[PDB]
Design a protein around this ligand. Structure first.
Ligand code: K
Ligand code: K
Ligand code: K
Ligand code: K
Ligand code: K
Ligand code: NA
Ligand code: SR
Length: 68
């Protein structure tokens, strides 16, 4: 269940863009406990990075990853 599940949020967004070749996947932050809308990219070396879904590169990267 989710009632007592911990919730993961984003507070800081990466300043710099990440090339598609370095991205393995993403997930969205849905929880209304979180301060703002966010995307977490997991890179090809499993590092997790907060990114702002308002930014266009973030949107396009998400679409690309969705396809493969
Ligand atoms: K300069
Ligand atoms: K220039
Ligand atoms: K191209
Ligand atoms: K212009
Ligand atoms: K494209
Ligand atoms: Na140059
Ligand atoms: Sr640039």
């Amino acid at each position: 269940d989710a009632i007592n599940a911990p919730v993961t949020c984003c507070y800081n967004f990466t300043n710099r863009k990440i090339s598609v070749q370095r991205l393995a996947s993403y997930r969205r932050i849905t929880s209304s406990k979180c301060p703002k809308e966010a995307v977490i990219f997991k890179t090809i070396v499993a590092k997790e990075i907060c990114a702002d879904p308002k930014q266009k590169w973030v949107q396009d990267s998400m679409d690309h990853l969705d396809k493969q």
